[PDB]
């Protein structure tokens, strides 16, 4: 038997271009700062970042 | 930036023992009939089944 269960998930946007991102450079210092790959390679953030997918 | 999004998913139980199942034998004929592996191997359903995980 199957039923529906409601749950949540995280959805990310690039803090710079405001676009939806799944692969993202995540700031290890800011609380809530992510960049798309293009913005990472264009306007680089002055904190250590990690690339998450 | 991250925010929460609400969404749903399917959760399955064994129609026989009523336990939660993730690996399950699914009836190809009934609309809503699943068996856990133990119940599949114990009280077999008189329809073709497929094993889903
Ligand atoms: Cl990159
Ligand atoms: Cl089996
Ligand atoms: Zn961007
Ligand atoms: Zn930062
Ligand atoms: Zn069962
Ligand atoms: Zn059946």
CB under 8 A, 24+ apart: contacts of B44-52: B49/B25, B50/B25, B50/B26, B51/B23, B51/B24, B51/B25, B51/B26, B52/B23, B52/B24, B52/B25, B52/B26
Radius of gyration of chain A (CA): 14
Residue A14 and residue B2 in contact, taking contact as beta carbons nearer than 8 Å: no
Whole-angstrom Cα distance, residue A32 to residue B1?
A: 5
* Alpha-carbon separation of residue A26 from A11, A41, B53 (angstroms): 13, 13, 33
CB contact under 8 A, B13 and A6: no
Which experimental approach was used here?
X-ray
Q: Is A40 helix (H, G, I), strand (E, B) or coil?
A: helix
Strand order in the sheet with A2-13: A20-21, A2-13, B2-13, B20-21
What Å resolution does this PDB entry report?
Answer: 2.0
Q: Please give the CATH superfamily to which domain B1-53 belongs.
A: Zinc finger, ZZ-type (3.30.60.90)
In angstroms, how far is CA B31 from the centroid of its own chain?
12
Place of tokens 């799944």: A22
User: Is the minimum CB–CB distance between A48 and chain B shorter than 8 Å?
Assistant: no
Domain regions of chain B by residue span: 1-53
CB contact under 8 A, B10 and A3: yes
User: Is the minimum CB–CB distance between B33 and chain A shorter than 8 Å?
Assistant: yes
CB contact under 8 A, B6 and A7: yes
């Amino acid at each position: 038997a199957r039923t529906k269960q409601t749950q949540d998930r995280f959805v990310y946007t690039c803090n710079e271009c405001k676009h939806h991102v799944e692969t993202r450079w995540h700031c290890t210092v800011c609380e809530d700062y992510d960049l798309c790959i293009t913005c990472y390679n264009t306007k680089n953030h002055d904190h250590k970042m990690e690339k998450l997918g």
